[PDB]
Amino acid sequence: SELLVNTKSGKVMGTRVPVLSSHISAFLGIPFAEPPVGNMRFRRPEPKKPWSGVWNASTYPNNCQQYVDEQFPGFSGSEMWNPNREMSEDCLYLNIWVPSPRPKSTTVMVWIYGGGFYSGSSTLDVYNGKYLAYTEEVVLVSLSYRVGAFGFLALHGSQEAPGNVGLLDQRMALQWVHDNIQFFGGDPKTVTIFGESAGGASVGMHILSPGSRDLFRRAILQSGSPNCPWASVSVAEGRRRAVELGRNLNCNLNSDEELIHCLREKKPQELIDVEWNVLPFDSIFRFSFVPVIDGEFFPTSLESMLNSGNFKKTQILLGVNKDEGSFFLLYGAPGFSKDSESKISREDFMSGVKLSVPHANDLGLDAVTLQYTDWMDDNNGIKNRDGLDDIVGDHNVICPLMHFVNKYTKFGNGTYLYFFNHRASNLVWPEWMGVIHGYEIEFVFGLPLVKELNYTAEEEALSRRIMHYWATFAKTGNPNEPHSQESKWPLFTTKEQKFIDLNTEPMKVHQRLRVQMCVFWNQFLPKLLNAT
Amino acid sequence: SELLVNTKSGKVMGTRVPVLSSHISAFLGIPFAEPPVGNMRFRRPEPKKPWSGVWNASTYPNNCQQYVDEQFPGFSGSEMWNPNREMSEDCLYLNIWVPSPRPKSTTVMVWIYGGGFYSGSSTLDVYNGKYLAYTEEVVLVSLSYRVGAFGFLALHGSQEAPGNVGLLDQRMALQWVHDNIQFFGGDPKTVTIFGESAGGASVGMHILSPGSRDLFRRAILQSGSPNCPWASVSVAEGRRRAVELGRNLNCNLNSDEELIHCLREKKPQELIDVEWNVLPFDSIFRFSFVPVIDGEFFPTSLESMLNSGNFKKTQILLGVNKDEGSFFLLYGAPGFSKDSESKISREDFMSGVKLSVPHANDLGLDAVTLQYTDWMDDNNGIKNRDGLDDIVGDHNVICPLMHFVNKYTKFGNGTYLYFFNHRASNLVWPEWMGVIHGYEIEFVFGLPLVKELNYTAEEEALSRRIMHYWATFAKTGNPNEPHSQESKWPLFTTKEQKFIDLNTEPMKVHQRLRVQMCVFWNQFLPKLLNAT
Ligand SMILES: *[C@@H]1O[C@H](CO)[C@@H](O)[C@H](O)[C@H]1NC(C)=O
Ligand SMILES: *[C@@H]1O[C@H](CO)[C@@H](O)[C@H](O)[C@H]1NC(C)=O
Ligand SMILES: *[C@@H]1O[C@H](CO)[C@@H](O)[C@H](O)[C@H]1NC(C)=O
Ligand SMILES: *[C@@H]1O[C@H](CO)[C@@H](O)[C@H](O)[C@H]1NC(C)=O
Ligand SMILES: *[P@](=O)(OCC)N(C)C
Ligand SMILES: *[P@](=O)(OCC)N(C)C
């Protein structure tokens, strides 16, 4: 039967799922690791012991233990990102959508969810791989990985809680895909990893980490890159947060062994309840437990790896959304609310600047403020609002990515860059938030093709164009069809810095994505803070 | 006779001069001080001893000893600013144009020439007061003052060369006008001083200096303000330059008395020949011998005087030209030449940035470069040229003036601000230099009314409008006619920061003259240099 697949770990039985008047196969909740529970909490993942009998792969697995957004109870705009299955520490599972009839050896895409390394689920409605797998004839995998303290508590030098284990979870899923996807009709040597936000940064981190490079062919990064200021901490800072966590739970702090032991007796929600108290600054766009630059997973600093070409050399496709900042300003910054226009006073602008660049001294904040203020009109609340939006997105997403782009391209084999600036017509978040980060995912996963979801015709066209770009790139390393028309997505190069925008209008090519602001963020402001 | 005036210093006989098909009286080369020659070189001026008989005031006096521009021999664009009379240390004279028949008690305007405190002449063709005096029925005075080492060699604590004596020359001329202008039909209590460039800065310095305030009613400043970075040095820096000068002339440097004595035995041209070797930095827009903040003429620093309201409170009218920077880039910066378009490479841009901000460290130069570079297009030689033009003008003229404007207005009785951006149709300097500083003077002195000078009709209109603004302001403290139409030059205020532009188009009102760049120059860059 087409729903039964013998893998090196044992047999699995999937389920036929309907999709757009046809059907395909889905194998849901396949374990790729031992449950990281009990004395294995905080440990590196172990491979799943093989099983006899048939593993029932017909339903979604649990989601990992995580903070749950209750800012807007009942609001679909926020609820659509919360876990939709029971949370559990037993959560290391993957899901596979397979064209029907089963391919013999086709392109494979593996999805890595975002969520600030503190949240995320493989089972969200908007991550349903059936439309992509069916439309583009790819084998679609989504993995899972521990988040929060469970994934990234870092007590460096200890083997019980070394850090980065959520990243090692991702790699174990990629190892399982490498070893077994051939039995689902996938080509293990044509695997594209792709992810958004912290998943985009995760993708970039596997490009860098030597122990991950050989497990995939090429990479797509959306709204995230490994060098983002929120995506890693030093070994000393990871240590400090781990101790501060045990201090919040009245733990014995006399040794790593005492500390880790206390944290493993706590119920998961006790860890989640205090996770946010360990941050060093009053800040936005910063998360407690994130990857650590440990000298093992990352051999040296990200910047010297980027400078020296110490990373996988392949093709990449990556890009950003227009309004990366609005979500985190909405949730953490004074003056912004969901039900108003969020016109920002000059005082609230300055508070926002302080929260957005928490490591800066006063001279640095003056520089950021000068850079983003229209001094002909400094009390325009629209401009103050949009100015803060740009500050948060430039600093945390766009300019880190553009730095990564420019360093990668010197050594890589092909870079394609996009700027997604279409705002979906059925968006429930207020207009002032614009093209909100994560809201290209639904176009990538093909949701506008489902008519009951009330997208425009042009949005359906845009989704089909994006899905065909991502899948053609996965298959060939180039998002363009060889011998079709449609104006070509140009290669990003060191001299042109060409990119396209993605929206419902006929595509245009531009150059030097936000170069003016990113010279400020990537070159000037670091030198200023270094001097003061 | 109308050409004979008995003054408190003795009788003077002037000359009838023709002007635009009529005539007026001119009294040229009236001495207001003893010749500052011999052992009086570098000394404070002494008042002119009265004379018997009639002083022949029918011809222009000598000009003061000064550096003479030979960069473009024969070129009228430069030659029109050089001395047109014999140079001599015997040069403290003034000139008066008087309407005919002689007024009984009319508005008085006193002109102070610019020239970087190192040059200038009261007798230039473009300073001919007959058109203004005749057209606006004012009594027009132009004074003179020592420049160069002769005017500003500063050995503080010495009474033989205390500094600022060129400024004291100006004040002695103003004292003479105060005491005697009534006999020429002038109203001594309605005197307006006005000057361009270093003369504008001179005007501002008399506003500040307590010993000058009572000698005039109101003030006009063109393209200069007392706080300009080139317009003053500290007492220690003035001392260092004075010693460096004597060192260039093999002077005994064991004491102030030995040093001053050696400098007084040198012929004037020996001083001029080495004057430029004493500058501390490789720089543009900096001059060797300039006013010194001495604790007497200026009681404390200019900035604390401005902050505390320690200055004359009256009405002022002031403004700038659009392209303040081009002259000094032409003369001192690599890549600029008179006969080409002066498209600037990125290397020459950076050299220019270094010359323009000589006191800055590398972080500061990076800030200036970032601020003025279009990073979408950083190899456009037009933009690099115009960018450097703006750097030089913003830093040296516009943003100092705007700082002065904003500090003065908090305490003054009326501020009018202008932006002169008409380029004269008969300008011989190349197009890339734009609206060059000093080239509003000819409109102020009414030269477009002389038909043989080949101005357009509209330029003649513009000159008449400007002359009527300056003279109405001098008479009343407001450049607008009470009960005429013509859209009104608005008052500059702390909240609007309204100004007008002056050109041949129907005037427009704007707000916040170059506020974005001047927040950089006046607030950010000082705090950055202070921190590094
Ligand atoms: C697989 O598990 C689901 C979970 O309830 C169950 O409903 C389904 O019948 C199972 N299928 C089997 C055991 O074949
Ligand atoms: C990709 O690699 C091949 C061979 O390694 C090379 O011929 C080709 O030019 C590369 N493409 C780019 C864009 O570097
Ligand atoms: C005034 O001086 C000039 C200078 O040469 C002379 O030509 C003129 O005749 C003199 N007028 C007198 C002395 O009345
Ligand atoms: C000028 O001064 C007078 C009285 O000193 C005052 O009534 C008037 O308002 C002042 N004008 C301005 C613009 O300050
Ligand atoms: P991403 O993972 O999405 C926010 C939850 N972010 C850039 C951290
Ligand atoms: P100004 O006096 O004119 C240049 C000779 N300048 C701003 C110093």
**Residue B374 backbone class (left: φ over 0; alpha: ψ -120 to 50; beta: rest):** beta
Neighbours of B311 (CB within 10 A): 23
CA B478 to chain centre: 22
Residues whose CB falls within 8 Å of the CB of residue B11, separated by 6 or more in sequence, listed in order: B4, B5, B53, B54, B55
Amino acid at B427: L
Query: Please, are residues B507 and B488 in contact by the beta-carbon 8 Å criterion?
Result: no
CB contact under 8 A, A524 and B366: yes
Residue A116 CB less than 6 A away from ligand 5:
yes
Is residue A470 within 8 A of residue A406, CB to CB? The reply is: no
Q: Give the three-state DSSP class for B154.
A: strand
CB-CB under 8 Å, A519 with B366: no
Are the C-beta atoms of residues A220 and A248 closer than 8 Å to each other? no
CB atoms within 10 A of CB B330: 21
Task: State the amino acid at position B133 in one-letter form.
Answer: A
Nearest to B325 by CA among B404, B225, B432: B432
Integer CA distances (angstroms), A506 to A416, A424, A479, in order: 18, 17, 17
Identify whether the C-beta of residue A498 lies closer than 8 Å to the C-beta of residue A491.
Answer: yes
A462 in Cβ contact with A502 (< 8 Å) = yes
List of domains in chain B? 1-532 (3.40.50.1820)
Nearest CA-CA partner of A360 in A277, A282, A293 = A282
* Tokens (6 digits) for A197: 């936000």
Sequence positions preceding breaks in chain B, C–N over 2.5 Å: none
Please give the single-letter amino acid code of residue B460. Answer: E
State the number of CA atoms in the 13 A half-sphere of B68 facing the CB.
15
The answer to whether A294 touches A162, Cβ cutoff 8 Å, is yes
Question: B47: cis peptide before it, omega within 30°?
Answer: no
Q: Is the dihedral of CA A155, A160, A161, A165 positive or negative?
A: positive
Is there a contact between A531 and B370 if contact means CB atoms under 8 Å apart? no
Candidates A375, A519, A531; nearest CB to B370: A519
Residue A399 C-alpha, separation from nearest chain B C-alpha, in angstroms: 14
Write phi, then psi, for A494 (nearest 5 degrees): -55, -40
- Nearest by CB to B512, which of A370, A375, A532? A375
The DSSP bridge partners found for residue B212 are none
A281: left (phi over 0), alpha (psi -120 to 50) or beta: beta
**Which H helix or E strand runs over A140?**
strand A139-142
* Residue position matching structure tokens 């013998």: A6
- Could you give the 3-state DSSP secondary structure of residue B209? coil
Whether residue B117 lies within 8 A of chain A, CB to CB, comes out as no
Please identify which residue in the block is written with the tokens 């995760």.
A202
Q: Is A13 on the interface with B (CB under 8 A)?
A: no
- Enter the resolution in angstroms: 2.2
What determination technique applies here?
Answer: X-ray
The total of other beta-carbon atoms located within 10 Å of residue A279's CB is 14
Spatial separation of the C-alpha atoms in residues A95 and B93, rounded to whole Å: 96
Q: Give B70's contacts (C-beta < 8 A, 6+ positions apart).
A: none
Give me the sign of the Cα torsion angle A269, A274, A278, A283. Answer: positive
| Longest Cα–Cα distance in chain B | 73
How far apart are the C-alpha atoms of B469 and B480, rounded to whole Å? 7
Kindly state the tokens that stand for B258.
Answer: 């030995």
Check: CB of residue A187 under 8 Å from CB of residue A108.
yes
Q: What is the 3-state secondary structure (H, E, C) of A335-394?
A: CCCCCCCCCCCHHHHHHHHHHHCCCCCHHHHHHHHHHHCCCCCCCCHHHHHHHHHHHHHH
In chain B, what is the straight-line distance between the N-terminal and C-terminal CA atoms, in Å? 68
User: What is the SS3 string spanning B385-448?
Assistant: HHHHHHHHHHHHHHHHHHHHHHHHHCCCCEEEEEEECCCCCCCCCCHHHCCECCCCHHHHCCHH
Nearest Cα residue to atom 8 of ligand 1: A58
Q: Are B397 and B437 in contact (CB under 8 A)?
A: yes
- Using the Cβ of B531 and the Cβ atoms of chain A, whether some distance falls under 8 Å is answered with yes
Dihedral (CA of B174, B179, B182, B183) sign: negative
Please give the Cα distance from B158 to B30 (Å, whole number).
30
Cα–Cα distances (Å) from B14 to A382, B11, B52, B108, B178, in that order, read: 66, 10, 16, 18, 19
Which amino acid belongs to residue B50?
Answer: P
Q: How far apart are CA A32 and CA A144, in angstroms?
A: 10
Q: B128 is written with which tokens?
A: 């001919």
The DSSP 8-state label assigned to residue B333 in this structure reads S
A511 in B contact zone (CB under 8 Å): yes
Per the DSSP assignment, residues forming a β-bridge with A450 are none
3-state class (DSSP) for residue A50: coil
Residue A528 Cα, gap to closest chain B Cα (Å)? 7
Rg, C-alpha atoms of chain B: 22
Give yes or no for a contact between B226 and B208, defined as CB atoms under 8 angstroms apart: yes
Q: Which residues contact B49 (CB under 8 A, 6 or more apart)?
A: B34
Q: Quick one: which H or E segment has residue A195?
A: strand A186-196
Q: Which residues pair with A87 in a beta bridge?
A: A63
> Which two structure tokens, joined as six digits, stand for B500?
């007008």
CA atoms of B315 and A329, how far apart (whole Å)? 47
In 3D, which of A196, A472, A226 has the Cα closest to residue A321?
A196
Contact B312, B385 (CB under 8 A): no
Instruction: Write out the H or E segment, with its range, that includes residue B178.
Output: helix B165-180
Buried b (16+ CB within 10 A) or exposed e, B102-113: bbeebbbbbbbb
From CA B250, how far away is CA B116, in angstroms rounded?
A: 26
**B217, amino acid identity:** R
- What length does chain A have? 532
Contacts of residue B30, defined as CB under 8 A and 6 or more positions apart, other chains included, come to B7, B12, B55, B57, B93, B94, B95, B96
Residue type, A139: V
Residues 311-370 of A with CB under 8 A from B: 363, 366-367, 370
| Sheet of strand A4-7: strand arrangement | A4-7, A10-13, A54-56
Residue A450 · residue A20 · CB < 8 Å? yes
Amino acid at B169: D
* Residues 6 or more apart whose Cβ sits within 8 Å of residue B176: B9, B32, B47, B48, B94
**C-alpha dist (Å) from residue A499 to A478, A507, B108:** 14, 10, 65
Residue B414 CB–ligand 4 contact under 6 Å: yes
**Residue closest to A46 by CA, chosen among A168, A197, A136, A150:** A168
Distance from the B357 Cα atom to the nearest Cα atom in chain A, whole angstroms: 18
To the nearest 10 degrees (0 to 180), the angle between helices B346-356 and B381-393 is 0
Task: Tell how far the Cα of B114 is from the centroid of ligand 6, in angstroms.
Answer: 6
Task: Please tell me whether the peptide bond between A101 and the residue prior to it is cis, using omega within 30 degrees of 0.
Answer: yes
* Structure token pair of residue B119: 């040059």
Q: Rounded to whole angstroms, how far apart are CA atoms A336 and A129?
A: 34
Asked whether the beta carbons of B392 and B324 are under 8 A apart, the reply is yes
Binary contact (B363, A527; C-beta < 8 A): yes
Positive or negative: CA dihedral A472, A473, A475, A477? positive
Strand A139-142 to strand A106-112: parallel, antiparallel, or no bridges (unpaired)?
Answer: parallel
- Among A217, A203, A14, CA closest to A107: A217
Instruction: State residue A319 phi and psi, 5-degree precision.
Output: 175, -175
What is d(CA A430, CA A156) in angstroms, rounded to the nearest whole number?
Answer: 43
**β-strand partners of A414:** A315
Check: CB of residue A189 under 8 Å from CB of residue A217: yes
Q: Centre a 10 Å sphere on the Cβ of residue A84 and count the other Cβ atoms it contains.
A: 13
> Please, are residues B241 and B289 in contact by the beta-carbon 8 Å criterion?
yes
Between CA A336 and CA B35 the distance in angstroms is 72
User: Rounded to an integer, what distance in angstroms lies between the CA atom of residue B411 and that of residue B378?
Assistant: 43
**Candidates A27, A51, A56, A85: which one to mutate for ligand 1, based on the most atoms within 8 Å of Cβ?**
A56
The answer to whether B184 and B27 are in contact (CB under 8 A) is yes
Q: Which residues of B77-96 are buried (b: 16+ CB within 10 A; e: fewer)?
A: bbeebbbebebebbbbbbbb
The catalytic residues of B are 197, 324, 437
**B531 and A527 in contact by Cβ < 8 A?**
no
Is there a contact between A245 and A275 (Cβ–Cβ < 8 Å)? yes
Torsion of CA B281, B287, B289, B290, to 10 degrees: -110
DSSP letters along A421-439, please? -PPPTT--S-GGG-SBTTT
E strands in A46-126? 54-56, 93-98, 106-112
Structure tokens at B147: 């420049």
- Closest by CA to B528, choosing from B291, B363, B330, is B363
- Closest-CA residue to B498 (of B439, B414, B411): B414
SS3 call for A209: coil
A213 in Cβ contact with A312 (< 8 Å): yes
Q: Is residue A138 within 8 Å of residue A132, measured between CB atoms? A: yes
For residues B2 and B100, is the Cβ–Cβ distance under 8 A?
A: yes
Which 3 state secondary structure label does DSSP give A312? coil
Are the C-beta atoms of B91 and B146 separated by less than 8 Å? Answer: yes
d(CA A200, CA A220): 7
Establish if A250 touches chain B: CB-CB under 8 angstroms.
no
The CA distance from A338 to A319, in Å, is 26
Question: Closest by alpha carbon to B471, among B165, B160, B218?
Answer: B218
How far is the C-alpha of A112 from the C-alpha of A170, rounded, in Å?
Answer: 8
Backbone angles phi, psi at A24, to 5 degrees: -145, 180
| Residue A189 CB neighbours (<10 A) | 12
Q: Across-strand partners of B111?
A: B142, B194
Q: Report residue A12 as tokens.
A: 């699995």
Contact B194, B221 (CB under 8 A): yes
Amino acid at B120: G
